Amino acid sequence: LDNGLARTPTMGWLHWERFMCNLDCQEEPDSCISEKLFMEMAELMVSEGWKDAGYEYLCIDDCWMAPQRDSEGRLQADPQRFPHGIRQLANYVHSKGLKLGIYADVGNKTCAGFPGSFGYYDIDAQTFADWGVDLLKFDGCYCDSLENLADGYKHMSLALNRTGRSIVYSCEWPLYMWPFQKPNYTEIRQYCNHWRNFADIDDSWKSIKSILDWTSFNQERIVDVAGPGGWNDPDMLVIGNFGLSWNQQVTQMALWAIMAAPLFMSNDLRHISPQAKALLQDKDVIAINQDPLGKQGYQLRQGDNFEVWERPLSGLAWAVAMINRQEIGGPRSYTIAVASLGKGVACNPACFITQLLPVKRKLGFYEWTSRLRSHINPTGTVLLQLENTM
Amino acid sequence: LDNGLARTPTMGWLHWERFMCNLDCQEEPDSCISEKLFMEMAELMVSEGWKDAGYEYLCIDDCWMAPQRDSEGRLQADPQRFPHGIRQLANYVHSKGLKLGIYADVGNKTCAGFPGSFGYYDIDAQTFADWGVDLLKFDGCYCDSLENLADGYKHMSLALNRTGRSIVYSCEWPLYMWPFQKPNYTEIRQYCNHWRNFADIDDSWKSIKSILDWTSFNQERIVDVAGPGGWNDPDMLVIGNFGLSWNQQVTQMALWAIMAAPLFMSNDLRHISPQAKALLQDKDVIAINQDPLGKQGYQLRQGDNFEVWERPLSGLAWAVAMINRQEIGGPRSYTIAVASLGKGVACNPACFITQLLPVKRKLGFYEWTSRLRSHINPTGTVLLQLENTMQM
Numbered sequence A: 001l002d003n004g005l006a007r008t009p010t011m012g013w014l015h016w017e018r019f020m021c022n023l024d025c026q027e028e029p030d031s032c033i034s035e036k037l038f039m040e041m042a043e044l045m046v047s048e049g050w051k052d053a054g055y056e057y058l059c060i061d062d063c064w065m066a067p068q069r070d071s072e073g074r075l076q077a078d079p080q081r082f083p084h085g086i087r088q089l090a091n092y093v094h095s096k097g098l099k100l101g102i103y104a105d106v107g108n109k110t111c112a113g114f115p116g117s118f119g120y121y122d123i124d125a126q127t128f129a130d131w132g133v134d135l136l137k138f139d140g141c142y143c144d145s146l147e148n149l150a151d152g153y154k155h156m157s158l159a160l161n162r163t164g165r166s167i168v169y170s171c172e173w174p175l176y177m178w179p180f181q182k183p184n185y186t187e188i189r190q191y192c193n194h195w196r197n198f199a200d201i202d203d204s205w206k207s208i209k210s211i212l213d214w215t216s217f218n219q220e221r222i223v224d225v226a227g228p229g230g231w232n233d234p235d236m237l238v239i240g241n242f243g244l245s246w247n248q249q250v251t252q253m254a255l256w257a258i259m260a261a262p263l264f265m266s267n268d269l270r271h272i273s274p275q276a277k278a279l280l281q282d283k284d285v286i287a288i289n290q291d292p293l294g295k296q297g298y299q300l301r302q303g304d305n306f307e308v309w310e311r312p313l314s315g316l317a318w319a320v321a322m323i324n325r326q327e328i329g330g331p332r333s334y335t336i337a338v339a340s341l342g343k344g345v346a347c348n349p350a351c352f353i354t355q356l357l358p359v360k361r362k363l364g365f366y367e368w369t370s371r372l373r374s375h376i377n378p379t380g381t382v383l384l385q386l387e388n389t390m
Numbered sequence B: 001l002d003n004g005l006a007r008t009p010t011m012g013w014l015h016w017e018r019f020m021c022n023l024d025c026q027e028e029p030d031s032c033i034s035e036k037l038f039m040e041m042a043e044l045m046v047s048e049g050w051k052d053a054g055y056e057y058l059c060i061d062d063c064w065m066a067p068q069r070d071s072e073g074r075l076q077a078d079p080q081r082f083p084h085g086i087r088q089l090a091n092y093v094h095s096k097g098l099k100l101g102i103y104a105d106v107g108n109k110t111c112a113g114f115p116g117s118f119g120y121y122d123i124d125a126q127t128f129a130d131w132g133v134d135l136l137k138f139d140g141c142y143c144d145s146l147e148n149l150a151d152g153y154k155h156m157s158l159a160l161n162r163t164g165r166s167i168v169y170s171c172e173w174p175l176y177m178w179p180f181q182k183p184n185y186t187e188i189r190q191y192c193n194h195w196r197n198f199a200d201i202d203d204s205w206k207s208i209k210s211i212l213d214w215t216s217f218n219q220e221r222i223v224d225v226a227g228p229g230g231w232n233d234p235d236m237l238v239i240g241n242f243g244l245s246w247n248q249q250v251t252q253m254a255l256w257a258i259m260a261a262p263l264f265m266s267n268d269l270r271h272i273s274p275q276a277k278a279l280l281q282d283k284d285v286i287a288i289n290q291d292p293l294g295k296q297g298y299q300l301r302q303g304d305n306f307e308v309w310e311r312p313l314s315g316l317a318w319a320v321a322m323i324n325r326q327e328i329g330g331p332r333s334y335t336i337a338v339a340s341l342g343k344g345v346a347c348n349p350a351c352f353i354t355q356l357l358p359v360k361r362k363l364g365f366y367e368w369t370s371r372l373r374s375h376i377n378p379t380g381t382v383l384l385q386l387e388n389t390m391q392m
């Protein structure tokens, strides 16, 4: 989407995976979908170094809406859970130097069953613009035809543009289409800053493996369309929650960097281990995700329960990720000719290799003739940066 | 098995899940199955508090053997990887205050393809005894028929007995029967100090879920046969490795205590986080696993991706485990009438409740009529100890 936004993949925080549709503010005031939750996260994004590391969009997912539109036909914030309303929440988030994301649905209801935007695309767009919203995530539920799905995603895209406000447009057009026909990604990119391809992430290693496996299977169709203003969205970072080992968290952070994914944390910034925080705030790894060239990486190889992925970077650098998919035993040895990496140019005539994950370690100078040898933890990833000597 | 051993579930370390059948000492020396791996593991069991906590048995799994029996038809330690032999490793292990486990197979070859024990039960049993072996793990690969399987396990049991050495006998008889017919656990219990029921664990939450789901589904068949001298074996603790979140690790330790499981760590004691170490050495959870009453716990309730397990302990005390099987969102609230726990006994007329996992927290006096309110992490477990009391 040529709106001048998402020139690098969008970074921030989204409530869905961790906080879901929790409407019980009486029995659970700290966990419920409320403006207090979003203000708490806004304060911590400033105070705990998130904004400084580049996490900039504080995003509301589903279940923020009143059950009905107003007399004037507009979407409303739940009067109890969002009593000051979205415009006022946007004002607070802006005062902290952050941006606000909100959620709507292309169909007749949101997925969780609140007002759909079908019939209301123009008003909803102008409502969001008036409220000071900086990002829209547009989910795909309760849409009766591919025709309505396409027209809706395009119509909301054009309606956002016409408001005159810079609003990042996050689409789920491919995801909701894929069961019925192959999406046209060239067309999707013309209308969307990023697009969900695949099933919702959850707090599990199974979920991460299924996202990587879908992405490597479909890479011919999706890798080349990605670039400044338009990204494949493999869904939220779940680092800092309950379901992932350290090595599985490292795999998610490393491969979300290789894939030039939007980095939307869905965690509790009030309760996050130092280790999870330092991984998510990892400057070198965010610098890979945020590389201004914006060329999506890809799977180079798969065999013997190993994966090699690589991403071309600015200035003749490459990122290389090596995944151990064997979930038994100890750190497993993998070796690859450096001449096989970055299409033959990364290490011709030589490259300096730095390991970034699981720990930062200079590995030294590798000649074009060299083999890189590494031990990779089960369900873990080794992330390397290659700098060509020339 | 009435050999006076395994009156509580056996505790120790077994190499299999973490080191497997790594024979490449040239290119993977730190991972390979060698005497030096076992010697170094023995030193760390002493120096890093493992023996103190109850982990007493240092056990060799498959791939210790020479490819062939000697001229006198006895088994041989691999000459390159075990050049000083089992006898001397047994001496080293005994010198540190620990006991040595070894492995063999009821059939013609070990599962990894080394010399099987069929035709040699008596000589192999005497070999282990002369060697100073304190435990045998006996896999089921390469067995012709149920008659051979059953005949072998029964044979090796009496063979080990006929040596007059105390040797914990660890059988996979049930596990290698399931593809043919349902096991008879009273027979198995007569011959074996513990028995593998289900497929090998690996370093994954999927593996843990699969072992717990098989256990709860099958609990009426297996829970009551367990007791001092004979235990259900749900396979090794894999805490300290790579595949489990903190919450999934707490779930394994909590539920292995509930199930009166033998506790065989399969990890690298040279490279283990303080957090995994503190969980595996947790005195209060080991004390549940090792409760002298020795009655195996069970799943009380399932529904809404929650599980409630409980285990009766000596002295009218109960352990209660609450598992959140929802792999999304945040900590979920679960409430239950204390009356519904410990068959209504635990908290009649009151109990004192101590949370043990994920952290140790005195919760206080609960009257028989009162409710217990908890919050359980996704893939995590809250483990509680209920002490029957007359106070409050």
Ligand SMILES: *[C@@H]1O[C@H](CO)[C@@H](O[C@@H]2O[C@H](CO)[C@@H](O[C@@H]3O[C@H](CO[C@H]4O[C@H](CO)[C@@H](O)[C@H](O)[C@@H]4O)[C@@H](O)[C@H](O[C@H]4O[C@H](CO)[C@@H](O)[C@H](O)[C@@H]4O[C@H]4O[C@H](CO)[C@@H](O)[C@H](O)[C@@H]4O)[C@@H]3O)[C@H](O)[C@H]2NC(C)=O)[C@H](O)[C@H]1NC(C)=O
Residues within 6 Å of the ligand: B002, B003, B004, B005, B007, B160, B161, B163, B164, B165, B166, B167
């Ligand atoms: C080869 O196979 C045979 C059986 O096939 C096996 O022999 C059996 O060995 C076991 C284990 O030692 C024997 O069990 C012990 O039996 C003695 C004697 O029991 C009889 O006589 C007593 C006299 O006191 C009577 O009261 C009783 O009713 C019996 O008729 C008992 O003294 C032993 O009990 C102690 O240990 C038990 C655990 O095994 C406890 O349950 C019990 O409470 C006892 O106390 C324990 O804890 C105490 C804590 O203070 C501690 O102080 C004690 O020292 C002890 O640890 C036990 O029941 C069984 O009798 C043998 N059976 C037969 C048929 O001979 C061989 O052992 C086996 N050989 C090898 C090497 O594998």
Ligand SMILES: *[C@@H]1O[C@H](CO)[C@@H](O[C@@H]2O[C@H](CO)[C@@H](O[C@@H]3O[C@H](CO)[C@@H](O)[C@H](O)[C@@H]3O)[C@H](O)[C@H]2NC(C)=O)[C@H](O)[C@H]1NC(C)=O
Residues within 6 Å of the ligand: A002, A003, A004, A160, A161, A162, A163, A164, A165, A166, A167
């Ligand atoms: C509404 O849709 C139009 C059509 O794409 C958007 O126009 C495009 O806007 C971008 C971003 O401003 C333009 O590129 C930029 O040009 C400026 C000024 O020269 C430059 O400084 C930037 O570095 C960048 O190259 C882009 O050329 C332009 N396209 C067209 C056809 O005019 C517009 O941004 C959208 N507006 C909103 C509110 O979304």
Ligand SMILES: *[C@@H]1O[C@H](CO)[C@@H](O[C@@H]2O[C@H](CO)[C@@H](O[C@@H]3O[C@H](CO)[C@@H](O)[C@H](O)[C@@H]3O)[C@H](O)[C@H]2NC(C)=O)[C@H](O)[C@H]1NC(C)=O
Residues within 6 Å of the ligand: A106, A107, A108, A118, A142, A143, A144, A145, A148, A149
């Ligand atoms: C949101 O809900 C509305 C109202 O239920 C949907 O409008 C209805 O959509 C159906 C298509 O499935 C239309 O039915 C068609 O009508 C013609 C006759 O005019 C008939 O030949 C077709 O076979 C079919 O039955 C229906 O006319 C239409 N109703 C109105 C009031 O417009 C709407 O499509 C839903 N939107 C999404 C995105 O699901």
Ligand SMILES: *[C@@H]1O[C@H](CO)[C@@H](O[C@@H]2O[C@H](CO)[C@@H](O[C@@H]3O[C@H](CO)[C@@H](O)[C@H](O)[C@@H]3O)[C@H](O)[C@H]2NC(C)=O)[C@H](O)[C@H]1NC(C)=O
Residues within 6 Å of the ligand: B106, B107, B108, B118, B142, B143, B144, B145, B148, B149
């Ligand atoms: C380990 O391998 C040995 C060598 O193959 C096995 O010994 C064999 O045992 C089988 C019984 O399952 C014997 O088969 C029978 O042979 C007789 C005729 O000799 C026939 O009447 C029967 O109908 C049946 O075919 C076999 O004879 C015997 N060995 C040899 C060399 O003939 C042994 O069973 C294996 N052990 C285990 C525990 O699996």
Ligand SMILES: *[C@@H]1O[C@H](CO)[C@@H](O[C@@H]2O[C@H](CO)[C@@H](O)[C@H](O)[C@H]2NC(C)=O)[C@H](O)[C@H]1NC(C)=O
Residues within 6 Å of the ligand: A184, A185, A186, A187, A190
């Ligand atoms: C996929 O979608 C794209 C964009 O809508 C289509 O490409 C356009 O096709 C028309 C007719 O060939 C051209 O006028 C435009 O130049 C194209 N736009 C761009 C930027 O390429 C393409 O036709 C669609 N492909 C398929 C197979 O349907």
Ligand SMILES: *[C@@H]1O[C@H](CO)[C@@H](O[C@@H]2O[C@H](CO)[C@@H](O)[C@H](O)[C@H]2NC(C)=O)[C@H](O)[C@H]1NC(C)=O
Residues within 6 Å of the ligand: B184, B185, B186, B187, B190
């Ligand atoms: C399982 O095996 C055990 C032990 O071999 C059997 O126990 C026998 O039970 C009968 C009574 O039905 C006793 O009279 C015997 O003395 C017991 N022992 C033996 C060695 O036979 C048990 O019956 C078997 N269970 C089933 C259902 O087959």
Ligand SMILES: *[C@H]1[C@H](O)[C@@H](O)[C@@H](O)[C@@H](CO)[C@@H]1OS(=O)(=O)O
Residues within 6 Å of the ligand: A016, A061, A062, A110, A111, A112, A139, A140, A141, A172, A196, A200
């Ligand atoms: C649509 C999105 O795919 C998901 O990320 C989230 O925004 C919810 C909101 O309701 C919805 O997915 S769901 O699978 O229908 O819950």
Ligand SMILES: *[C@H]1[C@H](O)[C@@H](O)[C@@H](O)[C@@H](CO)[C@@H]1OS(=O)(=O)O
Residues within 6 Å of the ligand: B016, B061, B062, B110, B111, B112, B139, B140, B141, B172, B196, B200
């Ligand atoms: C048999 C046991 O079940 C397992 O724990 C281990 O001891 C190996 C030894 O080779 C074997 O299982 S396997 O699935 O055949 O590897």
